[PDB]
Paper text:
[name] is a highly conserved antigen-presenting molecule that is ubiquitously expressed by all nucleated human cells, with cell surface expression of [name] being strongly ligand-dependent. [name] can capture microbially derived metabolites formed during riboflavin biosynthesis, including the most potent mucosal-associated invariant T cell ([name]) antigen, 5-(2-oxopropylideneamino)-6-D-ribitylaminouracil (5-OP-RU). Several [name]-binding ligands are anchored within the A′ pocket of [name] by forming a Schiff base covalent bond with the [name]-Lys43 residue, triggering [name] egress to the cell surface. We describe a range of compounds found in CS that bind to [name], and we detail the structural basis of their interactions, thereby revealing novel scaffolds that bind within the A′ pocket of [name].
To understand the molecular basis for the binding and presentation of CS compounds to [name], we determined crystal structures of [name] presenting nicotinaldehyde, salicylaldehyde, veratraldehyde, or 2,3-dihydroxybenzaldehyde. We used the [name] A-F7 [name] as a crystallization aid analogous to the use of Fab fragments, as crystallization of [name] binary structures is typically more challenging. Each of the four CS compounds was clearly visible within the A′ pocket of the [name] antigen-binding cleft and each formed a Schiff base covalent bond with [name]-Lys43 in the pocket. The aromatic rings of each CS compound adopted a similar plane to that observed for Ac-6-FP; was wedged between [name]-Tyr7, Trp69, Tyr62, and Trp156 of the aromatic cradle of the [name] pocket; and associated via van der Waals interactions. Each of these ligands was located at the base of the pocket and did not interact with the key [name]-Tyr152 residue. Specifically, nicotinaldehyde did not form any polar interactions within the pocket and formed two rotamers, showing its flexibility within the cleft and its propensity to form a water-bridged H-bond with either [name]-Tyr62 or [name]-Ser24. Notably, these four CS ligands, while making numerous contacts with [name], did not contact the A-F7 [name] [name], suggesting that these ligands would not activate [name] cells. CS ligands upregulated [name] included (1) benzaldehyde derivatives, such as salicylaldehyde, veratraldehyde, 2,3-dihydroxybenzaldehyde, and 3,4-dihydroxybenzaldehyde that are derived from complex phenolic components from tobacco during the smoking process, many of which are also added as flavorings to both conventional and e-cigarettes; (2) nicotinaldehyde, a pyrolysis product from tobacco present in third-hand smoke exposure and produced through the oxidation of nicotine deposited on indoor surfaces; and (3) phenylpropanoid compounds, e.g., α-methyl-trans-cinnamaldehyde. While the ligands identified here clearly bind to [name], they do not stimulate [name] cells.
Author numbering:
A (entry chain B): 1 to 97
B (entry chain H): 1 to 245
C (entry chain A): 0 to 189, 196 to 270
D (entry chain G): 2 to 201
Amino acid sequence: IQRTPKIQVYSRHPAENGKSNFLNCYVSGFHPSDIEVDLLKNGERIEKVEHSDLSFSKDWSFYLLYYTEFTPTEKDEYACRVNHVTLSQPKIVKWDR
Amino acid sequence: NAGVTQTPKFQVLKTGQSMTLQCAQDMNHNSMYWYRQDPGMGLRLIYYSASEGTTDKGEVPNGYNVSRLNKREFSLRLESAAPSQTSVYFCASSVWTGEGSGELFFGEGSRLTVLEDLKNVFPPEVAVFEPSEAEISHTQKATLVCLATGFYPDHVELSWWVNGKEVHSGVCTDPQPLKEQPALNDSRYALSSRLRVSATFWQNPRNHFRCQVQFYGLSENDEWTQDRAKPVTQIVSAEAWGRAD
Amino acid sequence: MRTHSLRYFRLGVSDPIHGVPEFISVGYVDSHPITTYDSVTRQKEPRAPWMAENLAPDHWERYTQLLRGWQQMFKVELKRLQRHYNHSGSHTYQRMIGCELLEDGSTTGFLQYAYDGQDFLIFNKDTLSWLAVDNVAHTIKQAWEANQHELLYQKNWLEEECIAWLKRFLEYGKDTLQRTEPPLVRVNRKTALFCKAHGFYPPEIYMTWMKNGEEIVQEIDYGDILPSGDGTYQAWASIELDPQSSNLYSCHVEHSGVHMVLQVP
Amino acid sequence: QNIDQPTEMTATEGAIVQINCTYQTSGFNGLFWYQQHAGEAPTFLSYNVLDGLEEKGRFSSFLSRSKGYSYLLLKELQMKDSASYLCAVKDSNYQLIWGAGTKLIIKPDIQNPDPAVYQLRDSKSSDKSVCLFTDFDSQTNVSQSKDSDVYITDKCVLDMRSMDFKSNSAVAWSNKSDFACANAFNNSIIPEDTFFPSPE
Ligand code: NA
């Protein structure tokens, strides 16, 4: 069985425009552990992206937290791009504020 | 099905010599060990090798080192031998380390003796002593005795050989040697042994008894400067024949 | 204390890619990675600072050696499993072991193995027997059950030695693990009602919606508990609002001994 | 960490003996007993990890983790059980801690005691004379010589399996010219009925 990733794009704090925050992309429930995660800024991949190490679940799936420090603005559109063996092409999940 | 094979069974060493002991296991185990056994102490690990590709120190690693040659061979080296390193060293093997009920399979042993000088090494003086006539009359059986005396170190294997084949029934050899001078730190030892046959067996004049003692001492490389004969490894027998009368 | 747990996970991959390891091992107190090891670094290293500060290098030296051995044991078991399944390609072998120390002092223990992310073998420390999910796993069950001593071994470790560790680790990260940060809860409109909660530790929180005093568990749409990234978590739980008739909705939040109710007007 | 077992134990053939092993350790992952005959390599005897008693043949091992103590129980003792029995405890990090061992020493059941001190024929290749204390009951102990040029060994148990026969024996020698069999074992407490055969 190959379980396909569940992606969720959210902010560390309730985001008020202008105030610094953190954008989080938490991938979980997937198997096997091979995975490539990127944070996008208006369609382009952000440079300095931090992330946790691969974590394990009681149900034998994995999970990862990819984050980045940013300042949310009204003009900017953020998303998360995950590739996996269970997906024909990269999947995009936009940050819906 | 050989088990754990370590060599040498016996060695004598001069302070400062190099020395490498060998150990092999044919059991396709993964964890191998080197212990040393001393009087009064429980076994103590020297080094261990959890898996073919790793090693690590044990409780008392100072003045030793090892090398995991492969999956079957784990070798102990003594860089600069020292009188404190005199002990019996056992090799051991188990399928895995960390497994809780996995026991240790041990090898035969290595009896090592680091000495200051070598001028204290001595082969044994063997001598057979025939049964008492009083004894045969009173018990109708016959006890011979074999005295191996004046040897140093305790590197001796005594064996009885009636009619040319080895025998163990009716034998009692002391389980530990006797210090001839209990005060001296470097005394020579004496080992006694009995063979007790039936009085009919002794009274056949055509039965031949031989008490042989295998001593482990020096090799060709060991420099010798003393007047007496160099005490190399040797076998020193004594025999006795049946007495009919 | 609350209910705490200690876990070790081991992961093996049959024919990994270039960068992927072949063996990974990570340890968890509650939800915190505490220890890590892999077939690349070949070293067991701490993952919580309070782990580094109270376990001496002797500890990390001893366990570095042990995982190296386990890494190879885990490869041997994997090769075996994959041959009995007649499977080509890259496949996944997983092990999890650990215990829980409940609030009222009772304890639990578990040990189980996985193959390609499914259950394979689940240990029962009370009947002292393995549960096999198929016949490849049946073969391993009989081999392991023949060595009765190694079953009694795992029982003692799960019930005494796992728990003994857990207590020690709790004092090592007391400040981290026994702290309580209660949550900030609001309600928003999106036509649905969203009950959002954030800023809380530990991560165990129940959030439901109630209609006029009765719960609607099939109508509630539950969110997942997500890490924020500063040590706290955030979750939400929504319901769909009826357009034909009004209703007294009320979000309920339980967390770390305190229960709060948000009535919407 | 610390393990304690007693140094040596003496019992009688065909009886029961209990070898205690207490320990205080960092954790606990199982208890082992190892048998080691004198001069030889230890082999695995028993393994205990949960409380209770485990029978394996005519050997039994017990464990109380709470009291932190195991004992080895040997039933119907035979001579071949005269060895050292080593106790070993696996600690929290799976390090074996070893106790010093216990030397188990069996007295054989002597059916018909016949204590005597015989003079053995001189050997033309040695200057020593040799006395042989033999056939005494297991309740007799052999004392180390007091004179510096006489040598007494500790007793030894001999079995002629062809006659199913067991006897104890000590040996004393010396090359000093005062030495005699009648006087060799005076430092020892010998049976009253010991047979001294007239000299030649
Ligand atoms: Na060393």
